[PDB]
Structure formats: C-alpha cells, structure tokens
C-alpha cells in the first residue's frame, strides 16, 4: 500500500527534471522489468566550489518507505565517505531527515541534497556518525582537510 | 561454582567471583570473539560489576584482559568495529539501530583505563577513544572521577 508515496514521488521526479541545481543528480532506479522504481533513487552531489570538496561527485542512494512522506527518506553514500557525519555504512543524517525532528511534507529532494552538500564542508561536530573522521577533524584540521582533498579527487568524474 | 551464562545474564561482583579463580579464562573461552558486537556486550557486562575493591577489581581487570586479548589477537577481528559499537553502547556515539541505555558508566570507564595500558591494545584506537571520552556528554559528566582518570591515562598512551 504505497500508492500515496508513489503519487508524490512521481511528481517530485517531474519537478526535479524541470529544475534542479546544476551538477546534482537524482533519478529513480529501474526494476528488473525495465519500469521505474520510484522508491529507490540514485543521486549524486557535486562538491561545493571554493571548498576542498570541489571537483568531486559523491554518489548516494535515496530509499523511500511505503509510508512516505510521513517518514523521511533514508540517505546513504555509496561508497561510504570520509566525513564526521557519514556513518561507516555510508548513512548520512540531517535534522530535516529525522521524523521526530525537522522532517515534514514541505521538505523536498532538492532541499535534502543541498542540505547534505552544505554538510559536507560544514560538519555537525556535536552529532558525528563516524569516529574516524570526527577524531581527525578535531585533532588535526590540516590533516583532515588533506584527507578530504584526496577523497574529492578520487571521486571526480 | 557458577557459570558464565548466568553471570552474563545477571552480572554482579559476587557472581563474577563465584566463577572461580580461572574466571578470566572462562569468560573469554565462552565468548564468541569472532563477533565484535558480542565482544562489546561481554566487555560491558563484565565491567559493569567493577568496584574499587581488591578482589573485584582484579577479577574484572583479568576478565577484560583475557577477553580483549583473545578478540584482538585474531588478525580477522575488526578493532575499529569493536570501538564503534562500544561507543554506541556507551551512548557516546549515535547509530542507526536501537541499543539499550547503560546506567552506570563507572565500571566501563575504569575497565577501559586498565585496557588501554595493556600490550594487546591497538594504540591506533586510543586517539578515537579519547576524542569521544572528552566530548561533552551527561553520562560521562556524572562519572567525572573515572572520566578524568581514563583521559589522563589516554594522554600517556
């Protein structure tokens, strides 16, 4: 019973195709039979210019639940990224991505992606999801920035 | 005479001692150290009965050393996963899954203080442990004494 989620996702797809930030990618995956799987989207976030993430194209998957948009979509970087707020599994979280926090119907895919992009260069040090990136970020910012640049190059188109 | 399963089910200083003078070997022998999550559980259950008293302190420390030596000695055991799950269970690092909330952090902190000084402990983990033990947290604040000791020890690693 995901008809309600599918009706919205179909409109979000059209809206995204009509207008979305340059460099960003958000497309539903395909089912084995060739039809669209609107519950599972393949996305890509370009590093923000002027930052150490520049030049990189970071891929992530957006998974929607049958009760969407009551619940937020689950976002996971594939592969997992070196970042304080990116879990080892690649899962990335934001206040607007938490049902019990700032998630709400007014939230769009464009908002989520831009929100995650902003997070990449401006980590949330109070709520890390990874111990490794958080540790280096706090103990040696220069080294942290270095790891980020290398990662940005590795993920350049 | 008591058994490991009963001790782990309902840990108590007395039950640990009732395991016998070989309790340390028994805890490790009966624990599936191939599974990081299981090692974390065993470690927390054992450390939860720590008391600043001769017999109990020795029993907990020896049990921890036997368990963690066995776990870390396997070239396959992922020490980083152990650390990550340990922090999650201690309520110091967020996670996707739901975990029980540990009441007293005194035992776990004092057990770690001892562990980080042993030869079997991978030094690469010290910086991460320190970053999360120094990070603001209500639970750690209530156990300042243990917290300060562990940090002072981590500084010397």
Distance from N terminus to C terminus of chain A (CA atoms, Å) equals 38 Å
The strand count of chain B comes to: 0
Instruction: Spell out the CATH superfamily of chain B.
Output: Ran-GTPase activating protein 1, C-terminal domain
Strand content range of chain A? 15-25%
The pair of chains with the biggest contact is: A-B, 14 and 13 residues
Largest sheet of chain A: 4 strands, antiparallel
The name of the CATH superfamily of chain A reads: Ubiquitin Conjugating Enzyme
Q: Please provide the ordered H/E string of secondary-structure elements of chain B.
A: HHHHHHHHHH
Total separate domains of chain A: 1
CATH architecture of chain A: Roll
Outline of chain B: globular
Shape of chain A: globular
Largest sheet of chain B: none
Number of domains of chain B: 1
3D structure, described in words:
- The complex is a heterodimer of chains A (157) and B (157).
- With 157 residues, chain A is α+β, with helices and mostly antiparallel strands.
- Chain A has helices at residues 3-18, 109-121, 131-139, 141-154, and strands at residues 25-30, 36-46, 57-63, 74-77.
- In chain A, a hairpin with a 5-residue loop joins strand 1 and strand 2 (36-46).
- By secondary structure, chain B is mainly alpha-helical.
- Chain B has a single domain (1-157), classed as Serine Threonine Protein Phosphatase 5, Tetratricopeptide repeat, CATH 1.25.40.200.
- The A-B interface holds A 87-89, 91, 93, 127-129, 131-132, 134-135, 138-139 and B 80-81, 83-84, 87, 93-96, 127-128, 131-132.
